[PDB]
Amino acid sequence: ENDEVLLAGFGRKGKAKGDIPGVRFKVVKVSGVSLLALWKEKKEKPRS
Amino acid sequence: PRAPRTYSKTYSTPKRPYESSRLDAELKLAGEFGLKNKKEIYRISFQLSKIRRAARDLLTRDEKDPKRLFEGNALIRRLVRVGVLSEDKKKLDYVLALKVEDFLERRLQTQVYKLGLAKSVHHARVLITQRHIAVGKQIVNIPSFMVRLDSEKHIDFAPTSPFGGARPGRVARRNAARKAEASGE
Amino acid sequence: PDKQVSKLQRKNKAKQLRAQRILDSIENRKLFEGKNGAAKIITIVPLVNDLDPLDILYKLLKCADDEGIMVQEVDSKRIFNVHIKKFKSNLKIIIPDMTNFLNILDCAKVADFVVFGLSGVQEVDEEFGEQIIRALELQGIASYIGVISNLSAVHEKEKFQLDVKQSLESYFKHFFPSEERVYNLEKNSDALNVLRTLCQRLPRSINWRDNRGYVVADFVDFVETSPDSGDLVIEGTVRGIGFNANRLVHIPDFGDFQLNKIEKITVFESNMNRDTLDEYAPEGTEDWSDYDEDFEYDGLTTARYDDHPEEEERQLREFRDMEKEDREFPDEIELEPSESAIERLKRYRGLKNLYNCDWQVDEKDPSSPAEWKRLLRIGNYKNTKNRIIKETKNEAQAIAGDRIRMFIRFPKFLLEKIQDPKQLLFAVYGLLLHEHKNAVVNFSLQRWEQYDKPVPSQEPIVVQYGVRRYTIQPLFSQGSNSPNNVHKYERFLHPDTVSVATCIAPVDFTQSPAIFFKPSPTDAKNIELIGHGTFLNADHSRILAKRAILTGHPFRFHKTVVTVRYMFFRPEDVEWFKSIPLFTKSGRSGFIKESLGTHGYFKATFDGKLSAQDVVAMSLYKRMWPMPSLPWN
RNA sequence: UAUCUGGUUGAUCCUGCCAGUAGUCAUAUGCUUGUCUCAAAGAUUAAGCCAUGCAUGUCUAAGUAUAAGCAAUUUAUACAGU
RNA sequence: GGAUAGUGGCCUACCAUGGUUUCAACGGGUAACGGGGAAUAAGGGUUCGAUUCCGGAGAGGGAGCCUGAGAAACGGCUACCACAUCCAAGGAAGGCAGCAGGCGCGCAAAUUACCCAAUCCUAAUUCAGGGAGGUAGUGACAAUAAAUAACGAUACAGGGCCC
RNA sequence: GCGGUAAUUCCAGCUCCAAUAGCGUAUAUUAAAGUUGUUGCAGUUAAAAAGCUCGUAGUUGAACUUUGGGCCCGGUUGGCCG
RNA sequence: ACCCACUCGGCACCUUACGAGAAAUCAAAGUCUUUGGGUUCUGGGGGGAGUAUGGUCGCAAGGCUGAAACUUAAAGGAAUUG
RNA sequence: GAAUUUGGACAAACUUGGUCAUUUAGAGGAACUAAUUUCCGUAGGUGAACCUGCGGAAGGAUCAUUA
């Protein structure tokens, strides 16, 4: 909670990735540290 | 601020990306002509696309017309001097019938193999990008050269850069000195 | 009714939304700006053993063009109330010692910037320096700036001097990649940008750190008013959300305290409503909260079902062995056939499924702590802490950026650990309403990056959540979301996937990050770090179930189904454990039936098809109970 | 450089849209990143506020010099080079 | 008639009742400076153009004006409004949408560097000056070319097949 | 859509592909789109013919007015003629 | 008044399938990819909704005009089959 | 030839009213979400899928008899 996420849409102009009822944006970067790289363990995420 | 430098990209990506004919048919070209990317084929498709466009517009024009005669003869003559088009087919109806193996016939990478003393078509390319081969007074280190059919009687090893003379290099220096001389103490 | 609301040009008049934001942007920056009511806090940490970071302040204050180079002599102060003329800012620069690792972690637990020294010559210390970056980085950094400071950034290398910059930028991004470049302090405007960035960039907030008022003490003194206790005098700048007299207050390595009065530089004492230095104790308020659930020895059948130095290293090899086998066959207790499996399994309760069944929350336990009723019960934890922070806003007498002489009730027992506030950092953290008193909490452990040694489930681990630090023998469980909130106990801890600890400790109301470690007094720096994690919530109803699996073999098939080899020993083992169903490894269910036991054999019944040279396993579940905890100083 | 392929049904032929595909001197972002030639770069939100420094000065044989300036005085206390 | 450098409702006096419109007036909106252009390539179009050139407009917001051939000039002034600076409190002082920097803002953009050597511009002028301009720094905005391996021997399986 | 359990789709390990110092995602836009239609749509039944007629602007609106024949001049193309 | 032949206009049947069409079917729904006689109106996936709001006409009931945020992977047409 | 000074156009701007739209703390309210025969038009009626009156359509399943 109370972090700094960067959003972008899914790729449908809004609505869904699939079954998801009313969620349209995915998170790309937390705290400037790029969820792809964290998920692949390439950087680290400092707190705030 | 000074005039903008004009620039324009060369290759043209294909429209259908996974097409089982094209993916395989390109790679035979990659084999025989020794190209590092499919982009190196695409550039040739683009050059051919501009000659087929420029030729295709002139066929909508009439014979005995100065634009077709002039721009036509300049097109044809420019393709004859690079050896893509053969000699008997100076018609401009034929320059649509060209294909990619005619431009790739004339890369210097293959001109060195077809020429002789480069045994392979990969060994030829390595001879190019490693500064060995030349065209004339000039060294060429870039494969996609389009040898212009008058320069075929001039391609050789360079004056410098062994295989051509005056030095053995690096590795023959370390052998002949720092092993064979190293037998002397 | 009227709903045109279209075709407007006064949209430009929605610049008033741009004036509210600029107005709040200035109202952010009243606190840090001026020679009056302002201070920044800066810490210089060398990530090598080298450098002696005095010189970092030397290189960094050449670009003040002032007389602030007169302070920072060979005279050792370590906290500097430096004002800079050139940026109208006043800084509190701290350097902690390189020996005390906890000094380092408790420094940036106060700071606003953490300037990291690096080196061109000597590599970053793997076992000390990297651990500094990780540990600060997991406790929460306000802000952070990189620095190369070696002369041998040039003096080694006329070999196109920069390229070490790619190694240290590239190295330095791998922890926190919000930093593009690492600044050199051996050139002018580079050092200037460091100084600018210290002076006028805002530091971000840390939520637990700013939802509690806190000061940095500039002067400490003690006043006798009692013959053992007394009063303190602590002068400093309030930077958190603030203070009220009725709260407690906390000091690291001293514990919780209760302040008496607060001077403002209007004075408030502390009236009736102040809280105390206990848990929710009261020694007769337990048995007003009466309970029911009894698992007696009534019924000699019918288990509870409700039908539907080198010796410690040998202990380390024992822990590695028990976790090694406890990986492969988990929860599989191996019965001694000589001894009766009834006395061992008296308190256990068998279940169809953990997730589906329901326990009444406690029981007539008596292996619980008797202080179970001496615990604060919480409703919705979200609807607790937003309310408490709401009362902290509305009742904060001390606005931040105010100078306060502070009056703390304090024993003369504890003056002998006090140092002067120059060579170290006596700094005082406020608390909230119920943040002193005990309830059942939950953390969320995850292992450290290098770490691979096994961690058993009730060995003691020091937990630093927020500021306070306790000695905790935890209770581990995997994270899952059962509706009954009943989860499977772990006997050891997983290789990677984030689990949940559980213990009794007093509550946090801010969900601070936590670092988990054991003290390593014989070893290197004073701690072997184990893990990091986050205070999840305070749940008393988090029921961990100890799983014990009894395992048997079949002998002869095709008849009913199956018999028993190793499962049981006596026909006494029938009556307890044969209303409880039974599972197998993509197979059948339920109801072993009696036979002989005189050698060993119990002719089972089942529901399904496949049986071969296989195993057969049942289960019994027991609640685990939390252990109470102590502080660590 | 004049191309379509999946989704509605028990199966069909359709209207039909959804999704896929390719370009973008259209920006952003993520991960990587060795060579050369070339090169944009606070436009979008905020024509919002600005610390400091700098961006507009100018002389010939040829407007006016008693500088109490400098040089050799040197053709000359009428001046007379700079 | 006045006024203007000058035609002109540009303005005053008197007089007349006209002028534009569904071939779309007028009003509203534009996340609209206009073009030359750009992207997409069967043809025909659609979408974009703040941005290297030309043209306009503005220098915090409006207004006024001096001086000059040329300014409604802001690296000129005057007042008011909104901001904001030093002050000994009497007063004094200012406008980066030049360049480099900041701070906010944001999804989003670099150096408080070197130099007049080119390009050209200004003056009494080959000489002085010019963040106009150039050079370097940063820069995966976009483009072009293109390294990360080439060849032998021996031996096993071949596909050939040398005569 | 794959996986209520012998996972072609989840998790890894090999192996393979595609592009290649580049590649991937968001957003916009163009193509694909003959789903904007002038070229070029569709209106019985799938969305669509206005309840009918009159009627101004608009758009469109039958045919017809010296045709043919001589007569040289007169540049090109093509050829045995070369 | 019939009966026969012929013709002009009208309401329809019926038959081919020449063409059309997705098909049922159609002398027009034909002469439209061999894609242009003249002209008016309407539609551009389905719900949200003929609702909200604004005018406007009506004594009233109401009629005319008529969105969007939003949500959705179908909704729909013709025809065959146990 | 300075301060000052009458009238004039150019006029920034101020103060009051009314009026409109918009941010803004905002005491409160109001609600808000989560633990079968087919029709059309129209009029009236019932807790409700609905029923009834008038006119209209099939978007609905013509065998026999006319020598």
Curated annotation (Swiss-Prot), chain A:
Swiss-Prot/TrEMBL keywords: Cytoplasm, Hydroxylation, Isopeptide bond, Ribonucleoprotein, Ribosomal protein, Ubl conjugation
Origin: domain of life: Eukaryota
Mod. after translation: The stereochemistry of the 3,4-dihydroxyproline has not yet been determined.
GO molecular function: structural constituent of ribosome
GO cellular component terms, semicolon-separated: cytosol; cytosolic small ribosomal subunit; ribosome
Cell compartment(s), UniProt: Cytoplasm
GO BP: any one term: translation
UniProt similarity note: Belongs to the universal ribosomal protein uS12 family.
Additional observations: Present with 10600 molecules/cell in log phase SD medium. There are 2 genes for uS12 in yeast.
Subunit organization: Component of the small ribosomal subunit (SSU). Mature yeast ribosomes consist of a small (40S) and a large (60S) subunit. The 40S small subunit contains 1 molecule of ribosomal RNA (18S rRNA) and 33 different proteins (encoded by 57 genes). The large 60S subunit contains 3 rRNA molecules (25S, 5.8S and 5S rRNA) and 46 different proteins (encoded by 81 genes).
Function of the protein: Component of the ribosome, a large ribonucleoprotein complex responsible for the synthesis of proteins in the cell. The small ribosomal subunit (SSU) binds messenger RNAs (mRNAs) and translates the encoded message by selecting cognate aminoacyl-transfer RNA (tRNA) molecules. The large subunit (LSU) contains the ribosomal catalytic site termed the peptidyl transferase center (PTC), which catalyzes the formation of peptide bonds, thereby polymerizing the amino acids delivered by tRNAs into a polypeptide chain.
Protein name: Small ribosomal subunit protein uS12A
Gene encoding the protein: RPS23A
Positions spanned in the full protein: 98 to 145 of 145
Swiss-Prot record, chain B:
Region (Disordered): 159-185
Record-given protein name: Small ribosomal subunit protein uS4A
Annotated GO MF terms: rRNA binding; structural constituent of ribosome
GO BP terms: maturation of SSU-rRNA from tricistronic rRNA transcript (SSU-rRNA, 5.8S rRNA, LSU-rRNA); ribosomal small subunit biogenesis; translation
Family recorded in the similarity comment: Belongs to the universal ribosomal protein uS4 family.
Further comment found in the protein's record: Present with 106000 molecules/cell in log phase SD medium.
S4 RNA-binding domain: residues covered: 106-180
Subcellular location per the Swiss-Prot or TrEMBL entry: Cytoplasm; Nucleus, Nucleolus
Keyword Ubl conjugation: yes
Cross-link (Glycyl lysine isopeptide (Lys-Gly) (interchain with G-Cter in ubiquitin)): K179
Taxonomic path: Eukaryota, Fungi, Dikarya, Ascomycota, Saccharomycotina
The entry's keywords: Cytoplasm, Isopeptide bond, Nucleus, Phosphoprotein, Ribonucleoprotein, Ribosomal protein, Ribosome biogenesis, RNA-binding, rRNA processing, rRNA-binding, Ubl conjugation
Any one of the GO CC terms: 90S preribosome
InterPro entries reported in the protein's UniProt record: Ribosomal_uS4, Ribosomal_uS4_CS, Ribosomal_uS4_euk/arc, Ribosomal_uS4_N, S4_RNA-bd, S4_RNA-bd_sf
Function statement: Component of the ribosome, a large ribonucleoprotein complex responsible for the synthesis of proteins in the cell. The small ribosomal subunit (SSU) binds messenger RNAs (mRNAs) and translates the encoded message by selecting cognate aminoacyl-transfer RNA (tRNA) molecules. The large subunit (LSU) contains the ribosomal catalytic site termed the peptidyl transferase center (PTC), which catalyzes the formation of peptide bonds, thereby polymerizing the amino acids delivered by tRNAs into a polypeptide chain.
Pfam families xrefs: Ribosomal_S4, S4
PROSITE patterns the UniProt entry points to: RIBOSOMAL_S4, S4
UniProtKB/Swiss-Prot annotation, chain C:
Subcellular location: Cytoplasm; Nucleus, Nucleolus
GO cellular component assignments: 90S preribosome; cytoplasm; nucleolus; nucleus; preribosome, small subunit precursor
InterPro entries found in the cross-reference section: AARP2CN (IPR012948), Bms1/Tsr1 (IPR039761), BMS1_TSR1_C (IPR007034), G_Bms1/Tsr1_dom (IPR030387)
Ranges of residues in domain Bms1-type G: 38-204
Keywords, ordered alphabetically: Cytoplasm, Nucleus, Ribosome biogenesis
Pfam annotation, one family: Tsr1_G-like
Kinase among keywords: no
GO MF entry, a single one: GTP binding
Transmembrane region(s): none
GO biological process: endonucleolytic cleavage of tricistronic rRNA transcript (SSU-rRNA, 5.8S rRNA, LSU-rRNA); endonucleolytic cleavage to generate mature 3'-end of SSU-rRNA from (SSU-rRNA, 5.8S rRNA, LSU-rRNA); maturation of SSU-rRNA from tricistronic rRNA transcript (SSU-rRNA, 5.8S rRNA, LSU-rRNA)
PANTHER family: PRE-RRNA-PROCESSING PROTEIN TSR1 HOMOLOG (PTHR12858:SF1), RIBOSOME BIOGENESIS PROTEIN (PTHR12858)
Further facts: Present with 1390 molecules/cell in log phase SD medium.
Role summary: Required for 40S ribosomal subunit synthesis. Required for normal export of the pre-40S particles from the nucleus to the cytoplasm. Its subcellular location and association with pre-40S subunitshifts from mixed cytoplasm/nucleus to all nuclear in RPS19 disruptions, suggesting it acts after the ribosomal protein.
Family: Belongs to the TRAFAC class translation factor GTPase superfamily. Bms1-like GTPase family. TSR1 subfamily.
Subunit structure: Interacts with RIO2.
Annotated protein name in UniProt: Ribosome biogenesis protein TSR1
Organism annotation: Saccharomyces cerevisiae (strain ATCC 204508 / S288c) (Baker's yeast)
